[PDB]
Structure formats: C-alpha cells, structure tokens
C-alpha cells in the first residue's frame, strides 16, 4: 500500500495547470493528463479497488489543491466515465463511499452513452445494508428523476426493467417520482408489466400518487400493457386499484 509515484508526479503538474493554464507546456500537459487519467483509473475503477488506498490519494489530492481534488475525482475517459461510473457499475460500494465523501463528486453527470452514476445503480444487486446506505447517499446527492439522453429513461425504469428490487426500494425511499414517462411515454409501472415483475409492480402501486391512467404514445395504459403481456397477477392488482 503506497501512493503511485507516477500518479502523484503527474498530479503536481496538473495542479500548476489548474492554477494557471500557461504554467505547463503542450508536451507537459498531454503527458500529465494521460498519466493521471490512466493511473487514477487503475487505482479507483478496478473491480478489486481498495477503498483505504482510494482515501489516501483523495487526501493527498486535497492537500495539493482543492481544484485538483475536484478535477481528478471527476476526470473522465474517452467514453465520459469517471471513477464513480465504474465503481457504481462494479458494485464496489466501499469505493463509491470514499468518492462520495470527497465532497466533489458529480452524481448526475452522464457518460457518452447518456447515463449518470445514479442510473448505473439500476443493474447492481445490493448485498448489504452498508451498500444500501451508500446508494441512498448517492441518490440524495443528485436528481433521482433525471432522464437518460438516449430514451429519456430514469433510474427507476432501468431498475424496474432489470428486476433489481432493492435498487427499486432505495429509489422509492428517496421519494422517486413513479409517474415520469420516457420518450415513448412509458412509465416504471409499464416496465414492471412488460417484464412481469409482480413484486416490483406492488412496490410501485403502493406509492399513493402512482398514476395508472397515464398512456404511452400508442395509448397503452399499464393495465393494457399487462393484459397484452399475459401478466394476470399484475393486471389483478390494477383491478383493485381501479376499485373492483
């Protein structure tokens, strides 16, 4: 366990550049940026990334410049992915925790594909209460109702379509808006109907403001989507909501 000298050496260079863009030559800037991006992503973004070692670098970055901490914590590869995107995507939540605690994370920033680290939680299977709390903290630092650039989907819709009940529970605990519609006019409840996630439809219908009369671009309500998908248990829960 030791601070990457290659990383620190290139961060000292970038600190001068962030103070004054004329302080590094063209060659020196290209080299330092390339090294920081590479080493920072070696250190933080791997599957086995060690949270204590992450914390130590974050303290050394801070003690160099508060502007360097922000710049490094939010540095992004050619696909727009940051340490937060990758460590959420690998479900390495002890590292996510360490990144969140830096104070400088951008939990709503979308990669080139159009998704924020909040949205990347949708495919995570949460294992422990520690992980759940980290996720809740992540959610509460940004806009849980934001829409991805591709199809206008939210975190809730993504999580609902992938059957990740615990991510759905954490979203609703942070008061996620269940009535948001994607570019097709689809709601989260309609995702549950398509994919037949009976329990998840339950969780959504338990949200009192859940609007079951919303329609997509073809005029389908959730009930229509549920009937066309042969999901009679979900359809049945919708009958009770329509007072039958």
């Amino acid at each position: 366990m030791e601070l990457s000298p290659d990383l620190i050496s290139a961060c000292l260079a970038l600190e001068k550049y962030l103070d004054n863009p004329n302080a590094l030559t063209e060659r020196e800037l290209k080299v330092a940026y390339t090294t920081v991006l590479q080493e920072w992503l070696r250190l933080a973004c791997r599957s086995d990334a060690h949270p204590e070692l992450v914390r130590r670098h974050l303290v050394t970055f801070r003690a160099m410049s508060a502007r360097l901490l922000d710049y490094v914590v939010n540095i992004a590869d050619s696909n727009g992915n940051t340490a937060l995107h990758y460590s959420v995507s690998h479900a390495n939540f002890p590292v996510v925790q360490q990144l969140l605690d830096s104070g400088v994370c951008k939990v709503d920033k979308q990669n080139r594909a159009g998704y924020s680290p909040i949205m990347l939680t949708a495919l995570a299977t949460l294992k422990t209460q520690d992980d759940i709390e980290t996720v809740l903290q992540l959610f509460r630092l940004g806009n849980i109702n934001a829409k991805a650039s591709q199809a206008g989907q939210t975190a809730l819709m993504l999580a609902v379509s992938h059957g990740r009940v615990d991510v759905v529970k954490a979203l609703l605990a942070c008061e996620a808006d269940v009535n948001v519609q994607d570019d097709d006019g689809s709601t989260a409840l309609m995702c549950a109907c398509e994919h037949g996630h009976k329990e998840i439809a339950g969780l959504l219908l338990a949200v009192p403001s859940c609007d079951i009369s919303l329609t997509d671009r073809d005029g389908s309500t959730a009930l229509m989507v549920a009937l066309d998908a042969g999901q009679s248990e979900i359809a049945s829960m919708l009958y009770s909501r329509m007072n039958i």
Partner: peptide, 15 residues
C-alpha cells in the same frame, strides 16, 4: 420500445 429492452452493464457504460 425501451420498456421492453434489457440493457447490459457494458451498454450502460459504452456507446
């Protein structure tokens, strides 16, 4: 329709 798609880990990360 997007509500019927199953996106993967790598589709969320890369495009």
């Amino acid at each position: 329709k997007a509500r019927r798609r199953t996106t993967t880990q790598m589709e969320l990360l890369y495009a």
